[PDB]
């Protein structure tokens, strides 16, 4: 009635070999192969329910050890199974995506281990392993015969859920100007995979103009994601059915739109009309010409102008989540999805649920892991898991890959069980990561540990990136110009490579447009007052508005008016020093009208270029950093051309996923996709071939 080990002891030598740490925290006198608890015998390998704390759910474990401790107490060791709740997913087991729920009978085998007194054992459980790729019928038979089952493992590091020339189509959701997708395809090319962005979705017309220019072959859709989803759904039925001022051809399709009520519309080109005369007409307005609808659907279906399920191998996206930081850091936390517009997160997972791509790459800000205790982060992950995708989560710091910034972002991998799960590429530059990891996801930082010192490239500074560019002025209307001369640095040599050198095949064989041209080297045109102000900022490291006339530092480093000088005014009669600057950060800020220096880095390139609250003034030139300079900071190849008003160009660059980051990820994707991946380490060291020359 009192727990007792059974059978003979494991051979002393064998026990010593099997479980070294126990001989020579708990130590063993000897090991057994079996134990009897409450009239039931258990054996090494048996799966068992284990008693946990008062009012906590019983643990679920695989018995790996049975031993008598040096304290003459009876212990057993378990390798734990995780319930979906037990993982990082937590309270988000309760979510469902398009009818995809977490089976309460699905567990995940971990490598976490714990010791226990024999009397914690509650009972045996029938847990079976089901091969995800086994035939569907057998699979149900197996699951039928069991108490619990597992098809994957769980690892705490990088929240990993994992199994136990070639072309690939990619779909870019919330594509912006195409930072992430461009980089992805580039890395992939290096892997030996030809990955091409086939469709892109973004509701900013200028972002689309940019992407479409640099990737003519891709179907660039200027619309809302949810509208795109609906359109897809209707596209399915259209393919299944296959269907004076004269209508010559139907050139486009869309669902809903800005002014239009829901439902399909076709873009018609009329006979005798130049493009730019084509317009959108509703579906029923064209009941007149059902043949032309046919021409278009059959034609679109064959060129795959739009994806049906199975058509898309990869999906990447950066669904906007706002209100999860700053003023909004503390509002709406209970139902974050209903709230505000974290809604794109749902839409993203909805499109993944509808298309079922072999791989999913989901990018986002670090706050999704912090806000509402990592709710959004968990939600994304939970969705992938409920959809039965393998998945892992990691945080990557842009500067680590050859950029003069520190831009930490979250990246979420997903991969069908029939696919190899991608890894995260280690830093290639010696930037050092701090304690920026949300204790919720403490083990998802992709970095080398201090324990391992590897030789990495010297961290890039601002001069490293923009020292070769020619002088320009506050007003610079030419979106295309000549470089002053040759590039000066390794980085400069790299971002000035042509499309071919970059393995960028968007224009196929042969060079594309703008070869060797300096594009978008234009800064925000400051109004006369602002311009007048920056003109007065000294050119020296650390210069800022405090250096402007009539201001001084009072006690406690708090800015003041200098009693000795009356407020200075510009020609316009406006104050040389604006009031907001005086109160920004309680009057302790050094940022307003701050000048950058070659020495320095820009922690995060942002969408706005105003000098009001940031150090964005060029080191030597009386102006704010130009668009192209921000682009380089963001790792864009110099050939990548931007369109739209200047402010919109800044927005594009500022939104983007750093290209080198996307390229590194691209490589990992390529390898996993080609089955040229290796065993199960979360992290992968890029090869010499990658990185630089």
């Amino acid at each position: 009635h009192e727990p007792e080990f059974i059978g003979s002891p494991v051979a002393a030598d064998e026990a010593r070999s099997n479980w070294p740490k126990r001989y020579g925290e708990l130590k063993a006198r000897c090991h057994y192969r079996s134990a009897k608890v409450d009239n039931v015998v258990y054996c090494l390998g048996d799966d068992v329910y284990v008693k946990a704390g008062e009012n906590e759910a019983d643990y679920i474990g695989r018995i790996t050890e049975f031993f008598e401790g040096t304290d003459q107490c009876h212990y057993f060791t378990c390798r734990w199974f995780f319930r979906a709740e037990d993982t990082v997913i937590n309270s988000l087991v309760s979510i469902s995506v398009d009818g995809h729920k977490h089976d309460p009978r699905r567990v995940f085998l971990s490598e976490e281990k714990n010791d226990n007194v024999l009397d914690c054992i509650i009972s045996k459980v029938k847990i079976v392993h089901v091969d995800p790729n086994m035939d569907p019928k057998a699979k149900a038979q197996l699951i039928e015969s069991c108490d619990l089952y597992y098809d994957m493992s769980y690892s705490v590091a990088y929240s990993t859920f994992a199994n136990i020339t070639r072309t690939a189509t990619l779909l870019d959701l919330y594509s912006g100007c195409g930072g992430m997708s461009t980089g992805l395809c580039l890395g992939a090319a290096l892997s030996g995979l030809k990955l091409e962005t086939r469709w892109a979705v973004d509701f900013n017309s200028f972002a689309c103009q940019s992407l479409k220019y640099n990737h003519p072959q891709t179907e660039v859709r200027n619309e809302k994601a949810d509208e795109f989803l609906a359109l897809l759904k209707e596209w399915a039925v259209l393919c299944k059915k296959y269907v004076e001022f004269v209508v010559e051809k139907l050139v486009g399709i869309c669902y809903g739109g800005s002014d239009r009520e829901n439902g399909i519309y076709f873009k018609v080109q009329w006979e005798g009309y130049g493009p730019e005369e084509d317009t959108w007409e509703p579906i029923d307005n064209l009941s007149d010409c059902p043949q032309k609808i046919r021409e278009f659907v059959q034609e679109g279906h064959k060129r795959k102008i739009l994806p049906l399920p199975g058509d898309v191998d990869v999906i990447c996206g950066g669904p906007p989540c706002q209100g999860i930081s700053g003023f909004n850091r503390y509002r709406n936390r209970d139902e974050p999805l209903k709230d505000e517009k974290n809604k794109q997160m749902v839409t993203f997972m909805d499109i993944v649920a509808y298309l079922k791509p072999k791989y999913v790459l989901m990018e986002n800000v670090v706050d999704i892991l912090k806000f509402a205790d990592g709710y959004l982060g968990k939600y994304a992950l939970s969705c992938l898991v409920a959809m039965k995708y393998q998945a892992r989560l990691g945080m990557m710091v842009a500067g680590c890959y050859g950029l003069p910034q520190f831009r930490m972002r979250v990246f979420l991998w997903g991969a069908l069980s029939s696919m190899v799960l991608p890894k995260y590429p280690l830093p290639t530059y010696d930037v050092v990561v701090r304690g920026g990891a949300p204790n919720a996801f403490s083990q998802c930082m992709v970095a080398y540990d201090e324990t391992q010192k590897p030789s990495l490239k010297k961290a890039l500074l601002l001069g490293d990136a923009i020292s070769d560019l020619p002088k320009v002025q506050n007003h610079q209307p030419n979106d295309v110009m000549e470089y002053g001369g040759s590039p000066k640095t390794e980085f400069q040599r790299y971002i000035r490579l042509s499309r071919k050198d970059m393995l960028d095949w968007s224009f196929g064989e042969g060079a594309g447009p703008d070869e060797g041209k300096l594009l978008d080297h234009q800064p925000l045109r400051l109004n006369n007052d602002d311009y007048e102000r920056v003109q007065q900022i000294p050119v020296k490291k650390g210069a800022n508005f405090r250096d402007l006339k009539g201001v001084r530092v009072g006690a406690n480093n708090i800015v003041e008016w200098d009693p000795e000088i009356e407020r200075v005014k510009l020609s316009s009669g406006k104050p040389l020093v604006p009031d907001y600057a005086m109160s920004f950060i309680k009057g302790k800020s050094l940022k307003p009208f701050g000048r950058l220096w070659w020495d320095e880095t820009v922690p995060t390139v942002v969408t706005r270029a105003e000098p009001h609250n940031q150090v964005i003034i060029h080191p030597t030139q009386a102006r704010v950093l130009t668009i192209r300079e921000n682009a380089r900071l963001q790792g864009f190849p110099d050939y990548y051309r931007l369109f739209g008003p200047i402010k919109e160009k800044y927005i594009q660059v500022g939104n983007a996923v750093a290209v080198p980051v996307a390229r590194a990820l691209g490589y990992c994707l390529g390898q996993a996709y080609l089955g040229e991946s290796e065993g199960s380490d979360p992290l992968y060291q890029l090869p010499p071939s990658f990185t630089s020359v």
Binding site: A52, C78, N114, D115, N116, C120
Partner: peptide, 5 residues
């Protein structure tokens, strides 16, 4: 009470 950790 096992102790998971």
């Amino acid at each position: 009470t096992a102790r998971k950790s």
